[PDB]
Amino acid sequence: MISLIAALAVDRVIGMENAMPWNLPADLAWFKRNTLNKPVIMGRHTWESIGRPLPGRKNIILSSQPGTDDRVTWVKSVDEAIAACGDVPEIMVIGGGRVYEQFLPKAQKLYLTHIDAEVEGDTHFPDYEPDDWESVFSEFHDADAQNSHSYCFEILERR
Amino acid sequence: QLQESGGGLVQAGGSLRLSCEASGRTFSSYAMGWFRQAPERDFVAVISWSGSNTYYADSAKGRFTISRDNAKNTVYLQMNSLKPEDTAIYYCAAPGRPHGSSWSLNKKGQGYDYWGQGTQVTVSS
Ligand SMILES: NC(=O)c1ccc[n+]([C@@H]2O[C@H](COP(=O)([O-])OP(=O)(O)OC[C@H]3O[C@@H](n4cnc5c(N)ncnc54)[C@H](OP(=O)(O)O)[C@@H]3O)[C@@H](O)[C@H]2O)c1
Ligand SMILES: Nc1nc(=O)c2nc(CNc3ccc(C(=O)N[C@@H](CCC(=O)O)C(=O)O)cc3)cnc2[nH]1
């Protein structure tokens, strides 16, 4: 089981040169509940973006270059990333864009958070054909004092 | 899939609310837009999937209001200071892509794959 988890804003935008301009504690909490104990796979940029290991999860970084941090496992290719993950019920892929574009056709489940935030970014979630995916779960939330924007949690299963 | 309701004849300066029911998909997941055609399809207004975002054409800014009622799978276009230049057929349109995926498209009147048959709006002097 290979899953992708991501927060998508308007036009599939998942990143810009800097931190997204929003504040979604509930989203990050969701991220945590659904990643905990499972191994996570990420590209180098996303690693650099987080700037610290995600605790309680085997952390795996894609990069053509040699590793620069020993608190985390570094891999040189996708098949290897998958090998580094071992025999686990479910693998979590956590970005960024280049890494999603590669793992999507190899994935059975998407954890998507939809934020109606008009934000311009050079990085996007891949285009997923709504015909290939069945939406099995959905929960919407209003913005509030702790969260800057509306967000919808969604879980998609490949038909 | 999409049925436009409301729409008839109204005197100048008059109001009139348009209605559009959409069946066949999960309503709350998709934006909804409005177009109008005069004997070329001009984009009028779009409301995002969550309702929190709205974009109005210049011809529509200030006068009109687009809103949605998920419990009734309907978007509405309220129209308030009508004039003979607004007279045309009005269509509801929906993006084929769910959520905010086609949003900048939809605001530019593109990225719509579903249309209604339209409702007539006539404004007399
Ligand atoms: N909203 C969200 O849910 C979300 C989630 C994650 C990330 N993001 C954002 O995404 C942005 C970055 O996106 P991105 O596409 O540029 O990050 P992608 O994570 O850049 O990572 C790419 C890097 O990983 C390595 N890599 C990827 N595939 C590889 C392969 N098959 N073999 C060897 N190395 C491979 C390469 O590193 P090397 O150059 O070393 O070879 C490549 O440059 C950030 O702003 C981040 O905030 C958003
Ligand atoms: N739904 C979703 N939202 C995201 O922000 C997201 N972000 C990434 C990449 N970037 C990040 C950046 C920070 C943290 C992070 O701080 N995670 C903490 C949460 C701390 C908290 O609960 O406040 C963690 O331990 O999981 C995770 C991913 C990948 N998938 C995502 N998926």
Question: Which terms summarize this structure?
Answer:
heterodimer, A: alpha/beta, Dihydrofolate Reductase, subunit A, 8-stranded mixed β-sheet, two-stranded antiparallel sheet, 4 helices, B: 125 residues, mainly beta, Immunoglobulin-like, 4-stranded antiparallel β-sheet, binds NADP nicotinamide-adenine-dinucleotide phosphate, binds folic acid, dihydrofolate reductase activity (chain A), Dihydrofolate reductase (chain A), folic acid binding (chain A)
Note down, in words, how this protein is organized.
- The complex is a heterodimer of chains A (159) and B (125).
- Chain A has one domain: Dihydrofolate Reductase, subunit A, CATH 3.40.430.
- Chain A has an 8-stranded mixed beta sheet, sandwiched between helices. Chain A has a two-stranded antiparallel ribbon with strand order 2-8.
- Chain A is an alpha/beta fold and 159 residues long.
- Chain A has helices spanning 25-35, 44-50, 78-83, 97-103, and strands spanning 2-8, 13-15, 40-43, 59-62, 73-75, 91-93, 109-115, 123-124, 133-141, 151-158.
- Chain B is mainly beta and 125 residues long.
- In chain B, strands 2, 4, 5, 6, 9, 10 and 11 form a 7-stranded mixed beta sheet that branches. In chain B, strands 1-3-8-7 form a 4-stranded antiparallel beta sheet, with no helix packed on it.
- Chain B has one domain (1-125): Sandwich (Immunoglobulin-like).
- Chain B starts with a strand and ends with a strand.
- Chain A binds chain B through residues 8-12, 114-116, 118, 127, 130, 135, 138, 140, 143, 149-150, 152, and chain B through 26, 28-29, 48-50, 52-53, 96-105.
- Folic acid binds at residues 5-7, 27-32, 35, 46, 49-50, 54-55, 94-95, 113 of chain A.
- Chain A: Key enzyme in folate metabolism. Catalyzes an essential reaction for de novo glycine and purine synthesis, and for DNA precursor synthesis.
- Chain A: One of its GO terms (cellular component) is cytosol.
- Chain A: Substrate binds at residues 5, 27, 52, 57, 113.
- Chain A: It is an enzyme of class 1 (oxidoreductase).
